[PDB]
Amino acid sequence: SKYGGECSKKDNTCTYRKDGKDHIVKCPSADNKKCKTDRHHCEYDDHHKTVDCQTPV
Ligand SMILES: [Cl-]
Ligand SMILES: [Cl-]
């Protein structure tokens, strides 16, 4: 599945909720996937094993 959360601009991480716990994973350093805006929605995609801290709004 895909798991949603919020990104930290300070740390360039995504904190996502999965099975009742929070998990923190680095965002990519790629320009249009990194955490550009603090607390932007982010997702960990467990099908692709990928993270995006600029999920489509
Ligand atoms: Cl937790
Ligand atoms: Cl910000």
UniProtKB/TrEMBL annotation:
Keywords: Antimicrobial, Fungicide, Signal. GO terms for biological process: defense response to fungus; killing of cells of another organism. Disulfide bonds join C7-C35, C14-C42, C27-C53. Transmembrane segments: none annotated. The keyword rRNA processing does not apply. The keyword Signal applies. It comes from the Eukaryota. This is Antifungal protein. It comes from Penicillium expansum (Blue mold rot fungus). The chain holds residues 34 to 90 of 90 of the full protein.
